[PDB]
Amino acid sequence: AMNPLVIKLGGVLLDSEEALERLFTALVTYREKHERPLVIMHGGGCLVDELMKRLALPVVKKNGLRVTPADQIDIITGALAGTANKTLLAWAVKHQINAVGLCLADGNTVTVTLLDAELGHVGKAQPGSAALVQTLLAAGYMPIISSIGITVEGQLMNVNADQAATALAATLGADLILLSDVSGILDQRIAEMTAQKAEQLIAQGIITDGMVVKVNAALDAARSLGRPVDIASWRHSEQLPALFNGVPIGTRISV
Amino acid sequence: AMNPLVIKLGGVLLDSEEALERLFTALVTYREKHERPLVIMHGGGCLVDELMKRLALPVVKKNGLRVTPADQIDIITGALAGTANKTLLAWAVKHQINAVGLCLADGNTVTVTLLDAELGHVGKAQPGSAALVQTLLAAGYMPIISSIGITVEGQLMNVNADQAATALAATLGADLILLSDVSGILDGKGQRIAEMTAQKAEQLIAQGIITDGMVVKVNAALDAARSLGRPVDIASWRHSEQLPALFNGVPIGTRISV
Amino acid sequence: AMNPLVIKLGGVLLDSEEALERLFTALVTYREKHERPLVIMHGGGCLVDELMKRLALPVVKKNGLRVTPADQIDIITGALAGTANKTLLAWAVKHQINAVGLCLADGNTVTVTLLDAELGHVGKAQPGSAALVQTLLAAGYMPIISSIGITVEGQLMNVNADQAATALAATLGADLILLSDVSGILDGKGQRIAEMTAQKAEQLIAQGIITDGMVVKVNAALDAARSLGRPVDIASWRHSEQLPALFNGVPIGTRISV
Amino acid sequence: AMNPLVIKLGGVLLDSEEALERLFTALVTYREKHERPLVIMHGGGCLVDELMKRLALPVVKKNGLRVTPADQIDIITGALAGTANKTLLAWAVKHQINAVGLCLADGNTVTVTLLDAELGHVGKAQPGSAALVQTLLAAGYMPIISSIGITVEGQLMNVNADQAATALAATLGADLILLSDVSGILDQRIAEMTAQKAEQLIAQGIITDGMVVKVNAALDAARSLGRPVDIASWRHSEQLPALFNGVPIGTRISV
Ligand SMILES: N[C@@H](CCC(=O)O)C(=O)O
Ligand SMILES: N[C@@H](CCC(=O)O)C(=O)O
Ligand SMILES: N[C@@H](CCC(=O)O)C(=O)O
């Protein structure tokens, strides 16, 4: 496994000091043996949701999926591009990993447009320019990228982190891991599946009540990329270095 | 002027779209004709204290420092490293300046340690490694740096933006401009002094011409100039038609040395 | 609605020309169709703390109160009673609303006493005499009142704008709107409650749905409603197309009672 | 002396706790005997100048007379319409005088336009509407009016207090006293003079080095009004009640 890897961290992972220690130890153990370019991408866990509750900011929704009003985007930018990003940076510093925090707009890494006027400040991700990240990687830095972007006209955008990760991996030609609390799908574990097989198992109610959402997100990413994406958990962390080297320790969704 | 230049933004700049539009129009005007490496350094503004009030969190500021308790540092990091930094970044994009948001810990650019345990999460800045920023500058990016740092042990630190600006300038071999509402120092015929030494400043303080809050401001500039071992400019954002010249080395406010 | 109405402006309103333009466009829209007596009540905003920083003066805010030392009260009175009040007045003129700037001492409208000597010049508000404001209203002026008061002994007092708004409303027999960034209270399905009693609020606090800073905000509203013995509206300035309806009595945010 | 009186307070008067106690005692002693409508008008003494020094704000000047830049008008509004106005209010409260603080823009009492683009936020005063003040007077309030106005387009203006006082007295049909530290002009005191006589005495160097400025201001006011204006000092304060009743205790400049 030469060739860059985007590791996208899920909400429940960021909410967990336990998980972060394991993830960051895993990054260290991996780096001692291998030398593949690594990029972290993240959204925001409960840090965001809890702050918004404190500020009486509702989780609005126009027939489906979240709305980010004018009066929320600054606060969210803060929790997400600020608190979450710099928390992960603090973890990198703690583990002596030279890391640089970025958001999507830095170097126009992932271009963002207005998804829909009625959802407010939500961005649609699409591949941007690889130069900035390539420069940082070649200089020995691990970028840690948040899922906040900026439109070309200067407006801050809250972007689905999964979609951001997909646009990033396409920009970089990177593999993609969506790391969360879902270890893998069973039927006896399933190491590889096509996206269509994953849809089938959902359709026939094999894939677990809560966490259809996690497989749907992997399978969308796989199809957007035209190549496979890994789902994996932080739980069995002694296995994370093998994952970062290409081993599907959880479930690979192929296309 | 061919040296790298650190431009430090005072609070009022971040609090006002007029001020930001003037600042950024000036940056574009200057980069049309000049290519000297530019770095923006900034602190918080009104928005941290707005947010503290919204969350009914206490505020204690003394001697230029905000007591920053364990239960406030994340929120503060959010407002500074997040909202402020990304707002500035959005201004850059809107003006087609290829910028990159950093904080002090990125690349160990400015090293920070715990200043004093009774202030909570407040950092002492010192010069770190120039490598990261030098790489960004050489590739044509204008870094925009917030005044949040991280200790070697992984603790988030709220750092005084003036001191962080100084540590940064020292790291970069850069000149330094402290941009705020203060245009310059007056000489008690009420006239602006273009170039002021430390000796002139003492004279003015001893004589009671520079008084109160100007004393603090003038000392912050002098402490900057002494650390850097070269002069530091003080200027206002108001006459923004003059700012390109300032960025090209003309002391439009007060230049402080010695 | 035919009762007099006190509209209390939260800090963020004064800090932003967009917010002021929305507020004042709403006031004009409302006065086109409705003639109910309107009074504006306001505190400080960002500009007091900007000014404290410019003068390198210390800041201690706790429990909704700023410790206001003898050597700060004049400056603070300047920023609140002066700059803020007159800025609002200028917005009125610009919108052709015949307004009149007052403070709490004018006509003994809201009586103030020393709250607590260790807070320095901080006032406790209580209802005073309605005569002055009633005279201005009956003559067609929209009073704009700052939250500075004066003790019977002639000392200037910095007063919490929420408490002053309450004392004012009580004096005037007026309804009360606390306008800020808070749009309403959420019920922990995340939905806005149009009408909330004290009992509902306790339930939400006991259950940990209203938490932290919302607790303080909700208590400030409840303390207002208990003093006045009638409900108090909480709303945001954001959807300013809804504000005329709010001023005409529709609870567009959360109405608080009991 | 029926008919309103504007008492304009000079800088050095506001700077002096001594002077204010005397002025306010004088207002009380006068009110016990007489019932003439009284209006106070003021600028700002050292309160303004000292604050501006603290803030490194220069006293600019374009060939003559002060400039009020964009970056000064808020701070000045604060010291002047705020601190100075409410200080005088505190004095009224201390002496149980029902008083109301106002600025020029309140009720469009004194209309203000841009004097000159190059002086920045300096206003030219001119008579406005008497209604608001008349209403307050008829209701038993003593207005205390600061020399800050607002243009019709919403811009704050720093206005010469003497000129403001003149525009006010014309608006109200009031007599006018410019109260300061100059007790009166000698040659043996002079109780009445025409403005032209006052110019003559200046011209021939009889009228004292410093305080030509104070006589010039009275004589300009007199001519603008087309009727007399009093100069008087707070010093001999047992004489101030007679002044407020019409007695020229200092020097009247006639026209
Ligand atoms: N951190 C969450 C949501 C963050 C986001 O998409 O903005 C996740 O990716 O599972
Ligand atoms: N609240 C920060 C502000 C950073 C700055 O503006 O200097 C401090 O006192 O450390
Ligand atoms: N600094 C004032 C603010 C007035 C207000 O906004 O409520 C206080 O705490 O009393």
Ligand SMILES: N[C@@H](CCC(=O)O)C(=O)O
């Ligand atoms: N208070 C001073 C000057 C104030 C002003 O004109 O603004 C005076 O009238 O003598």
